């Protein structure tokens, strides 16, 4: 029941000592299903440090302190094992390999593109798959609708402009425009499809008056000649 | 499949036109389309049936 | 990431080509206008 988020809400509300999530046998064990070993760098570890530093005063009303100390012992043991493996890795380095540049350029571009979940090439009907396209379009829409509007830029070429305390250089909004062109092109996607349907169904509905090899055909010329036959009168 | 279209007529003319130039160079067998239509045992059975009709009408 | 970090730390790659946009986004000041809103 969001045991890692309840401590964050109690830290943001500045009232983590009056309730302290009320860790008991029926409350601290229901939200955990021993803490579940969070995987953040410091966003969920400093909260555990503060949660240990606050509860040093009651000293008996919370029973998960032993599990938190065992988790800290596991973290220290993993840190010591990682330092011994880092020493073994730095002592196990061969002297000469002469690593090339082209394979490095192949690895860096692919590892940069695989960070932010986009397509990378190798260079080494159907409604079931359209919902999967719409779920990726709406994902980027909901991602671009969470950016702050007060976004400014700073390039490495501004030092020739001599920006004073009140200067207003003309290279501040070079990324705020590009953060809106994508957001308003993902919304006009259904707008351009109507123009494409009005264009293709007007340039391809005839297809036998401007294209020469389709109007120079023996079947098509005879058909266009024979559909214009006026009905014969009687007597 | 009841009606024909422009692409169907063009593909029909093209498949009827390629098989004529394919037989001059003799890179295709075209014997299964020959023997199954000639069928010499069916031809001699046809001659025996016409002889039987001669024997029945005389 | 650790392997490509240790290659740079140990093998001393001779070129290490720089491919960056030479820019990074920051947060700028927001402020409301000083002319009052008429109704």
């Amino acid at each position: 029941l969001q045991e890692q988020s309840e401590l964050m809400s109690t830290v943001m509300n500045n009232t983590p000592t009056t309730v302290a999530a009320l860790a008991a046998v029926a409350a601290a064990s229901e939200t955990n299903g021993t803490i579940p070993k969070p995987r953040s760098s410091a966003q969920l570890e400093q909260l555990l440090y503060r949660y240990r530093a606050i509860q040093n005063h009651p000293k008996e009303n919370k029973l998960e302190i032993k599990a938190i100390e065992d988790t800290f012992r596991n973290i220290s043991r993993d840190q010591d094992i990682y330092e011994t493996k880092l020493d073994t890795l730095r002592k196990s380095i061969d002297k000469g390999f002469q690593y090339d540049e082209d394979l490095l350029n192949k690895h860096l571009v692919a590892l940069q593109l695989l960070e932010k979940d986009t397509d990378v090439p190798d260079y080494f009907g159907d409604p079931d798959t359209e919902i999967r396209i719409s779920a990726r379009i709406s994902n980027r829409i909901n991602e671009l609708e969470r950016l702050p509007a007060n976004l400014g830029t700073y390039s490495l070429d501004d030092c020739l402009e001599f920006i004073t305390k009140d200067d207003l250089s003309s290279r501040m909004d070079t990324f705020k425009i590009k953060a809106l062109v994508e957001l308003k092109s993902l919304k006009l996607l259904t707008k351009q499809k109507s123009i494409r349907q009005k264009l293709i169904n007007n340039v391809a509905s005839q297809a036998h008056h401007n294209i020469p090899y389709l109007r120079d055909s023996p079947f098509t010329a005879a058909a266009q000649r024979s559909v214009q036959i006026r009905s014969k009168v009687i007597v | 499949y009841n009606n024909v279209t422009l692409k169907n007529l063009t593909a029909f003319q093209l498949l009827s036109q390629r098989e004529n130039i394919c037989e001059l160079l003799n890179l295709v067998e075209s014997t299964e389309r020959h023997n199954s239509i000639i069928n010499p045992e069916r031809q001699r059975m046809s001659l025996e049936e016409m002889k039987k009709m001669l024997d029945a009408l005389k | 990431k650790r392997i490509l970090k240790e290659v740079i730390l140990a093998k001393k790659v001779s070129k290490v080509p720089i491919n960056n946009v030479r820019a990074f986004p920051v947060l700028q000041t927001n402020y409301n206008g000083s002319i009052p809103v008429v109704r």
């Binding site: 350029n105 192949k106 860096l108 571009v109 940069q112 593109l113 960070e115 090439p121 260079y123 | 001059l24 160079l25 003799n26 890179l27 | 491919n19 960056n20 946009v21």
Partner: peptide
């Protein structure tokens, strides 16, 4: 973890003899 420009990504990213031998003959 630094981004790379798009201009570098876009910069990095028996049937013959079957007729001759027949055309020589026929």
């Amino acid at each position: 973890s630094l981004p790379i420009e798009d201009n570098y990504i876009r910069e990095v990213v028996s049937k013959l003899m079957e007729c001759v031998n027949d055309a020589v003959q026929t």
